[PDB]
Design a protein around this ligand. Structure first.
Ligand SMILES: Nc1ncnc2c1ncn2[C@@H]1O[C@H](COP(=O)(O)OP(=O)(O)OP(=O)(O)O)[C@@H](O)[C@H]1O
Ligand SMILES: Nc1ncnc2c1ncn2[C@@H]1O[C@H](COP(=O)(O)OP(=O)(O)O)[C@@H](O)[C@H]1O
Ligand SMILES: Nc1ncnc2c1ncn2[C@@H]1O[C@H](COP(=O)(O)OP(=O)(O)O)[C@@H](O)[C@H]1O
Ligand SMILES: [Mg+2]
Lengths: 741, 115
């Protein structure tokens, strides 16, 4: 009942609250009493409690000034409690804000404080900001000393003196721009855990004393760079009001013997001096590697110093040591002990709703149009991290700026107000910024987008639907699979004659589907080193596992995967050893993450059968040579953009092109258009020659085009692919499955 | 109007002799706002501790005479890679420069340029 929704005031000044009378009866609060309110980031307010007949039971009415003091906005939650034993003030010190008194040369006391404090008995607190009208401009003040402190009632006898140094706007803007729990998005559950370890012992240590346990003093944070580990550390340090001390791994390290140890000791001494403190050790992996692994004694010396420091630290101090690392396995196992960051909190890539929250956080100050939709940007930024999202917002702002340069004159200092008001962020700006931004989760696997769309792919309608469903159904409909209690399928293999659309069906998923795409050329993963070829496989899957839902595409899988044990010339078993590493990654003793594996192979008979069993590549889809209907769709799809003459009958071409592949038809279109380039070039040249045509490709261009065309795949080659698909049919339970009776 | 973060850090990079110092002097001659130039050799020539004071005083005077154009010619002298460096004074100067870069609250109207 103490928690209250923030509501607007009607006639209430800076020291009265208007609440519902039934709650006054509930909370035992009388009219005219002095009340205590607490808000976000440890702000306290003393007010004279009043009743109102129009206030909702769960709501509290307050003006702008206290909300700005309490750092709470309309709709937030505040705490209400009695504030007894508040005595009269003996001597209070007030100081104005620098920007509110610019150009004011009057007597601050008589003009502002006396009319405000005249016979009003207003309650005040140290650090309060109250706005007083009068003179030539309203003047804000900061209360810096209260006698008694921190609460007092301003009686008429209270000697009020306003002399001193005016408060800068720096602290006022910092208070609003200080990080807090609101500045964190996409990590609600991890933030709750960190709250449990840090905030709760501070708020209610009585529970720990009752149970007689000491909460852990160390929190280990690991994740991809920029996910928000430092931001979380600073936010939790600022909310708890603890002194935030930041340590970077490189600057601790030193060439001189024992200097890094001294830096660590001095830092821990400063933390223990300034309490409460929250030590943050960024880049813990570099500063403290495994003692047995490293050969440089300085690293093991640093680790031993850190062990002794963190062990002797737990003397019931109020200091909590947290660290951030990219990879926790690199950290020395001696640290993973009890104490010494005994708990590890995992921060991951922001999700769609998480990155939507991050965008809402980073655009709350920014001016946005009504055309721009945030859920769209949340969708389009597939693998972006929060830092990338903030950079995206800034880049969109500079996008709007470079658009509006040509209007504004840099020469004159004069600024037009309407040109200024016209400026706002638009959807096109976000689109540009996204186009020139990279996903840090996949920045290592960067590749150009050939811009292929489902409408581009001619034919293969049944195969197209399966690719849409397989990638979309788990991510878009996760509850449906839980309802039926079965996990989805995550493997696809395309085998067929070359040029029929195996790569297209993957280049379409890279663009249309809202799943991350990591692309693998066949022999790309192999390395001449002994243990690196298998290690490359591990890290590519770890990258895909991290950024799920991800589509992993193995182009020319026949190179990577062979039937194993074929011959001893396979790099001394290195090729067959890569198979075994892939086998465990697809189907091993790890939780099935949303990694969809697609492989495009020409010859599938050489593929290791352990790869092709269900659970690794369960669905085998055969892509044949296009049929009469399919060959029509390929021709229409290719010539969609190009201007084609009406008298051309694309259906006729498909009838004569019996066995040409998909790429064979595209060559005809390119050849037909290539001749049309030659004709227009010559006609334009002829026009130049005579002085000193063909807007659309005609049917005449086509007739000379086919005589250059040829069939890429021979009849015998089709038989091999045809033979393979027949074997799969023979393996199945014979006859169309008919349930008895 | 849009409440965004102007880019405080501008980095000019390229082969030497191309005119980065030329652009520095051109900016210095033709900017209405306050200008103050600091050189990597000039900072490194100063003894230990005083370079700290020189950099802090330069930034303080820049934010005092706002707006300001801060230029660091030969930046690599005062910010060698922390991955590959020996001198602890250089490390401390790098940390100080990093902190002062993070110091700006954007009401200082102070731009920092590097060549
Ligand atoms: N069904 C189709 N619809 C439209 N274009 C197609 C189709 N099949 C092939 N193409 C065209 O073929 C060209 C490239 O074919 P693609 O890369 O998909 O072949 P592939 O079957 O993966 O061959 P490979 O086994 O040699 O890698 C493109 O110009 C593409 O437009
Ligand atoms: N969950 C988040 N919510 C809001 N901003 C975030 C979040 N995660 C990262 N950021 C942004 O990333 C920047 C800080 O990156 P940080 O995560 O501190 O680097 P690292 O984790 O590599 O030390 C900040 O500007 C912050 O706005
Ligand atoms: N386009 C140009 N016009 C005039 N002077 C130039 C031009 N390009 C280079 N310079 C000359 O080259 C010098 C620039 O050297 P610079 O590249 O700044 O040295 P460093 O990069 O080693 O500090 C200036 O003294 C300038 O006079
Ligand atoms: Mg291909």
């Amino acid at each position: 009942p103490n928690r209250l929704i923030v509501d607007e005031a009607i006639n209430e000044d800076n020291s009265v609250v208007s609440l519902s009378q039934p709650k006054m009866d509930e909370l035992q609060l009388f009219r005219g009493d002095t009340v205590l309110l607490k808000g976000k980031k440890r702000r306290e307010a003393v007010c004279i409690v009043l009743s109102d007949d129009t206030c909702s039971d769960e709501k509290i009415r307050m003006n702008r000034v206290v909300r700005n003091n309490l750092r709470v906005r309309l709709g937030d939650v505040i705490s209400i409690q009695p504030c007894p034993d508040v005595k009269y003030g003996k001597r209070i010190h007030v100081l104005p804000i620098d920007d509110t008194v610019e150009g004011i040369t009057g007597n601050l006391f008589e003009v502002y404080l006396k009319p405000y404090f005249l016979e009003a008995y207003r309650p005040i607190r140290k650090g309060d900001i109250f706005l007083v009208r009068g003179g030539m401009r309203a003047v804000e003040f900061k209360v810096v000393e209260t006698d008694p402190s921190p609460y007092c009632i301003v009686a008429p006898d209270t000697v009020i003196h306003c002399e001193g140094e005016p408060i800068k706007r720096e602290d006022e803007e910092e208070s609003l721009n200080e990080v807090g729990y609101d500045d964190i998005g996409g990590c609600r559950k991890q933030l709750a855990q960190i709250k449990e370890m840090v905030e709760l012992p501070l708020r209610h240590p009585a529970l720990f004393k009752e149970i007689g346990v000491k909460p852990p003093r160390g929190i280990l944070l690991y994740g991809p760079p920029g996910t928000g580990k430092t931001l979380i550390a600073r936010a939790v340090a600022n909310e708890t009001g603890a002194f935030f001390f930041l340590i970077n791994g490189p600057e601790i390290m030193s060439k001189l013997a024992g200097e890094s140890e001294s830096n660590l000791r001095k830092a821990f001494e400063e933390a223990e001096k300034n309490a409460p403190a929250i030590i943050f050790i960024d880049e813990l992996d570099a500063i403290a590697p495994k003692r047995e692994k490293t050969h440089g004694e300085v690293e093991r010396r640093i680790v031993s110093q850190l062990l002794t420091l963190m062990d002797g630290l737990k003397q019931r101090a109020h200091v909590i040591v947290m660290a951030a690392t990219n990879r926790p396995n690199s950290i020395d196992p001696a640290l993973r002990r009890f104490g010494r960051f005994d708990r590890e909190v995992d921060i991951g890539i922001p999700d769609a709703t998480g990155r939507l929250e991050i965008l809402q956080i980073h655009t709350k100050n920014m001016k946005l149009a009504d055309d721009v939709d945030l859920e769209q940007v949340a969708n389009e930024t597939h693998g972006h991290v929060g830092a990338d999202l903030a950079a995206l917002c800034s880049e969109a702002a500079l996008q709007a700026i470079r658009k509006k340069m040509d209007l504004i004159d840099l020469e004159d200092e004069t600024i037009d107000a309407e040109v200024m008001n016209s400026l706002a962020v638009t959807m096109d700006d976000f689109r540009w910024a996204l186009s020139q931004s990279n996903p840090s989760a996949l920045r290592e696997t960067v590749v150009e987008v050939p811009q292929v769309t489902w409408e581009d792919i001619g034919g293969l309608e049944d195969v197209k639907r399966e690719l849409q469903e397989l990638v979309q159904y788990p991510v878009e409909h996760p509850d449906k699979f839980l309802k039926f209690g079965m996990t989805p399928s995550k493997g696809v293999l395309f085998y067929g004659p070359p040029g029929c659309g195996k790569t297209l069906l993957a280049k379409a998923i890279a663009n249309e589907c809202q799943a991350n795409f990591i692309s693998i050329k066949g022999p790309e993963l192999l390395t001449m080193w002994f243990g690196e070829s298998e290690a490359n496989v591990r890290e590519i899957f770890d990258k895909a596992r991290q950024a799920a839902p991800c589509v992993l595409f193995f182009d020319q899988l026949d190179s990577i995967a062979k039937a194993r044990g074929g011959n001893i010339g396979d790099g001394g078993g290195a090729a067959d050893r890569v198979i075994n590493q892939i086998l465990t990654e697809m189907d091993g003793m790890s939780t099935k993450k949303n990694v969809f594996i697609i492989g495009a192979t020409n010859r599938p008979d050489i593929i290791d059968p352990a790869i092709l069993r269900p659970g690794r590549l369960d669905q085998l889809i055969y892509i044949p040579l296009p049929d009469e209907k399919s060959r029509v769709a390929i021709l229409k799809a290719n010539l969609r953009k190009s201007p084609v003459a009406k008298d051309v009958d694309l259906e006729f071409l498909a009838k004569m092109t019996n066995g040409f592949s998909g790429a064979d038809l595209t060559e005809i279109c390119q050849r037909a258009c290539k001749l049309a380039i030659r004709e227009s070039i010559e006609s334009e040249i002829r026009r130049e020659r005579e002085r000193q045509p063909v807007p659309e490709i005609r049917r005449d261009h086509f007739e000379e085009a086919m005589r250059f065309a040829r069939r890429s795949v021979s009849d015998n080659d089709i038989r091999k692919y045809e033979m393979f698909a027949q074997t799969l049919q023979q393996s199945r339970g014979f006859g169309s499955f008919r349930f008895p009776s």
